[PDB]
């Protein structure tokens, strides 16, 4: 049966609740980590929160205009009227997305705000037969839908290499300086549990909201196709993950086009 080992792994820190069920074995709700809904630091990082340093729009409209500055910074605004990505959005080379911010003259509900509006999808954490823990959806999710964000603990490239647990890191490659990481091993939200699949229904997009300090993008997962209810969430981890972890185990993603089996 479907044993509800938790009603909300997030303890009410998310807009909708995220339950954990287990219908394959004894393992209880996972608790070897601290759930956080936003990113934190352990070592101080000189993030540029200086308000006068923000690019911002002055739209007298809802930032549908061809004149929205923040849309220009994303090349265009890629959000449709109900905050889904356009079909012309390039899932293969996702652009940088700059959402409107508190410096903009626009209203909190202008069109260029999506990631920042919190989690909007009913998902759930559950036990899988082949990969341990996994995250799956309980509703249909259209394509181009902001599913969730990869939240974790901001650490330097350096500190990244010295940690004995590389199973939860996410590379945040600023080209134009130091490269940073999100380690979601000790602190993290639900995305720490999302598994790798070679035909991924999810794609990470680099997104800027309350600050535009390029060293620290935030990582947003949008759906690449329709996700039917019950479907497990998955995204491509990349080659550097498999160059390394592959030497120790293979990809039980189960796809016919599976590239790491």
């Amino acid at each position: 049966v479907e044993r509800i080992v938790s009603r909300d792994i997030a303890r009410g820190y998310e807009r909708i609740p995220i339950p954990c069920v287990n219908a394959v074995d004894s393992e209880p709700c996972p608790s070897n980590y601290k759930y956080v809904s936003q990113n934190c630091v352990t070592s101080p990082m000189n993030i540029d929160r200086n308000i006068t340093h923000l690019q911002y729009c002055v739209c007298i409209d809802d930032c549908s205009s061809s004149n929205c500055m923040c849309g220009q910074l994303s090349m265009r605004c890629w959000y449709d009227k109900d905050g889904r990505l356009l079909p012309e959005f390039n899932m293969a080379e996702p652009p940088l997305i700059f959402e409107c911010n508190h410096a903009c003259s626009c209203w909190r509900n202008c069109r260029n705000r999506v990631v920042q509006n919190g989690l909007r999808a009913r998902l759930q954490l559950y036990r899988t037969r082949d990969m341990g823990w996994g995250v799956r959806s309980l509703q249909d999710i259209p394509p181009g839908t902001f599913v969730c964000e990869y939240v974790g603990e901001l650490i330097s490239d350096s500190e990244a290499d010295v940690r004995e647990e590389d199973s939860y890191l996410f590379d945040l490659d600023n080209k134009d300086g130091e490269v940073y990481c999100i380690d979601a091993r000790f602190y993290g939200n639900v995305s720490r549990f999302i598994n790798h699949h070679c035909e991924p229904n999810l794609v990470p997009v680099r997104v800027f909201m309350a600050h535009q300090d390029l060293r620290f993008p935030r990582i947003a997962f949008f759906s690449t196709r329709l996700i039917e209810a019950g479907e497990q969430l998955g995204f491509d981890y990349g080659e550097r993950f498999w160059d390394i972890k592959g030497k120790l185990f293979s990809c039980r993603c189960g796809s016919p086009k599976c590239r790491h089996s």
């Binding site: 990244a160 590379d171 160059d243 972890k245």
Partner: peptide, 5 residues
């Protein structure tokens, strides 16, 4: 070390 991207 193994990084997701």
């Amino acid at each position: 070390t193994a990084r997701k991207v």
